[PDB]
Write a protein that binds this ligand. Structure first.
Ligand SMILES: O=C(N[C@H]1c2ccccc2C[C@H]1O)[C@@H](C[C@@H](O)[C@@H](OCc1ccccc1)C(=O)N[C@H]1c2ccccc2C[C@H]1O)OCc1ccccc1
Lengths: 99, 99
């Protein structure tokens, strides 16, 4: 589809059998979701954005479905204000910026 | 042009007769640039990101050229880690997300 930017580009994602709303964020290098439980081991990581850094848990090889498109990649979990779908996963669904 | 996301979507912008590099960020509601001098009066604004909030200076009706496209709008200036072109200007240049 073609998503305009008059409003925040929010989409429904499916992860771990749960439906959630997330932002397609081209400014985010990685994907970070609000606190939740995911299978497997995780490594601690610090990510920085506007306002500073937050500590998150890094999970690898996580399957996520974005608007019907299956994608696999690293997913970070932590105290993020909103669910963010970053470039590591946007590339997998063939998302591009056009103008 | 069509920009993929395997690397950060950085583009050259021109503001105040100077060339700078900025990120095309669909996750940013507004446009915020690193500390610099702009004409006119400014108003206070607080913007929240993944790590918290930062105070910025808001300048209105600022001329900014993005990857060749001229835009005139609100530009925020503050302690941002990188120059960010947000949705307010992305819409002016007709930028959309596609997949
Ligand atoms: O903060 C955000 N948006 C806010 C904003 C920005 C400017 C002006 C106004 C407003 C209001 C609001 O929309 C966006 C910004 C995000 O696109 C990016 O910023 C560029 C950036 C790039 C590199 C280093 C630092 C910063 C980032 O933090 N990347 C980092 C990141 C994110 C997730 C995972 C990893 C990493 C590493 C960095 O790439 O975050 C999503 C969000 C939306 C709404 C509310 C809270 C949070």
């Amino acid at each position: 589809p073609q998503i305009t930017l008059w409003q925040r580009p929010l989409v429904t994602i499916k992860i771990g059998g749960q439906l959630k709303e997330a932002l397609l964020d081209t400014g985010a290098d990685d994907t970070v979701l609000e606190e939740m439980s995911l299978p497997g081991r995780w490594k601690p990581k610090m990510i920085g954005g506007i306002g500073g850094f937050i500590k998150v848990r890094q999970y690898d090889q996580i399957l996520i479905e974005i608007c019907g498109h299956k994608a696999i990649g690293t997913v970070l979990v932590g105290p993020t204000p909103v669910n963010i779908i970053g470039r590591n996963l946007l590339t997998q669904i063939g998302c591009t910026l056009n103008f």
